[PDB]
Amino acid sequence: LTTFSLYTIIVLLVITSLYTLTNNNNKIIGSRWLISQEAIYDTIMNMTKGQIGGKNWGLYFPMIFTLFMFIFIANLISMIPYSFALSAHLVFIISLSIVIWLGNTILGLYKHGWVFFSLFVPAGTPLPLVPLLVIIETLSYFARAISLGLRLGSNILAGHLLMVILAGLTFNFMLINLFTLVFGFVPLAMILAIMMLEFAIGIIQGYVWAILTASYLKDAVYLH
Amino acid sequence: VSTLIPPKVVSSKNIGSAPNAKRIANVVHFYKSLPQGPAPAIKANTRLARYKAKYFDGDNASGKPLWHFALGIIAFGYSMEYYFH
């Protein structure tokens, strides 16, 4: 129904194009565009074999890949001048984060029993600070519940708002008298620099999500 | 005395060396080899096989499709701006 629904469809179709005509029918030699999707493959091969390496790392390799690419595409599309809050609709992003965090907590409880609660015993510290370190390990464990979502959401939301707030101000700079319209381009160049930074930090955040929910999974699969 | 019969017996030199393995590979691969491969992608037709051909072929990766793809989404919301305003 919603505007949001239409843009979620647009994201799906963009991702399809990355493995349908970005590919040169799957050319062994590799095309200029398909080389890109090789390098992404390699840095996530070497990252999620590196993070969640072990007996199972490839078993969670599609999951971490669809968390990379989704955020990778959704922080370019949302950075188009007219394009709707998907990642600035935080309620979807944070919910997805909590779901994955719960799917780690459940995975850990299920796979590693009630000695999953040994994850919240960090070490064999002296006995008078053992109970304290259970309390503020579980606390930090469900601070991990909300941190992952709030990272991506805040970055994207703040970026769009910063650009828009400055756009309205420089509009009124170029609406007031011509001595201000001379030196009307100088603040504009600042907004351009900010737009460059916001595109950059969205890809940086895109790597940061997928390493963090590899890191939480590193903690969950391999006890402690 | 009378020579032995090994020099005139051969029957396991054909597993005896490594290029035998390569041989049985490349008799299949090369015998049924094509002179050239099939395609570097070409489908997207509807007056858009040209769009892919100009922009998303191995010929070039340049910023022209990016601009085009960006502009489609801009055209959607820009028109909708006046639907909202």
Curated annotation (Swiss-Prot), chain A:
SUPFAM superfamilies: F1F0 ATP synthase subunit A (SSF81336)
Effect the entry attributes to changing I136M: In strain: D273-10B/A1
Location within or outside the cell: Mitochondrion inner membrane
Effect noted on mutating G206S: In strain: D273-10B/A1
Transmembrane segments: 1-21, 57-77, 90-110, 115-135, 156-176, 181-201
Reported impact of A210T: In strain: D273-10B/A1
One Gene Ontology term from the biological process aspect of the record: proton motive force-driven ATP synthesis
Membrane topology per record: Multi-pass membrane protein
Pfam families on file: ATP-synt_A
PROSITE patterns: ATPASE_A
GO MF annotations, alphabetized: proton transmembrane transporter activity
NCBIfam families: ATP_synt_6_or_A
PANTHER family with a match to the protein in the record: ATP SYNTHASE SUBUNIT A
Protein task: Mitochondrial membrane ATP synthase (F(1)F(0) ATP synthase or Complex V) produces ATP from ADP in the presence of a proton gradient across the membrane which is generated by electron transport complexes of the respiratory chain. F-type ATPases consist of two structural domains, F(1) - containing the extramembraneous catalytic core and F(0) - containing the membrane proton channel, linked together by a central stalk and a peripheral stalk. During catalysis, ATP synthesis in the catalytic domain of F(1) is coupled via a rotary mechanism of the central stalk subunits to proton translocation.
Protein name from the UniProt record: ATP synthase subunit a
Gene source species: Saccharomyces cerevisiae (strain ATCC 204508 / S288c) (Baker's yeast)
Gene name tied to this protein: ATP6
From Swiss-Prot, chain B:
Residue span relative to the full protein: 7 to 91 of 101
Any further remark recorded for this protein: Present with 14600 molecules/cell in log phase SD medium.
Similarity comment: Belongs to the ATPase F chain family.
Principal location class: mitochondrion
Keyword tRNA-binding recorded: no
Organism field: Saccharomyces cerevisiae (strain ATCC 204508 / S288c)
Top-level lineage group: Eukaryota
Summary of subunit composition and partner proteins: F-type ATPases have 2 components, CF(1) - the catalytic core - and CF(0) - the membrane proton channel. In yeast, the dimeric form of ATP synthase consists of 17 polypeptides: alpha, beta, gamma, delta, epsilon, 4 (B), 5 (OSCP), 6 (A), 8, 9 (C), d, E (Tim11), f, g, h, i/j and k.
Keywords: ATP synthesis, CF(0), Hydrogen ion transport, Ion transport, Membrane, Mitochondrion, Mitochondrion inner membrane, Transit peptide, Transport
GO biological process, one term: proton motive force-driven ATP synthesis
Cellular compartments annotated: Mitochondrion; Mitochondrion inner membrane
Its biological purpose: Mitochondrial membrane ATP synthase (F(1)F(0) ATP synthase or Complex V) produces ATP from ADP in the presence of a proton gradient across the membrane which is generated by electron transport complexes of the respiratory chain. F-type ATPases consist of two structural domains, F(1) - containing the extramembraneous catalytic core and F(0) - containing the membrane proton channel, linked together by a central stalk and a peripheral stalk. During catalysis, ATP synthesis in the catalytic domain of F(1) is coupled via a rotary mechanism of the central stalk subunits to proton translocation.
Stated name of the protein: ATP synthase subunit f, mitochondrial
Record gene name: ATP17
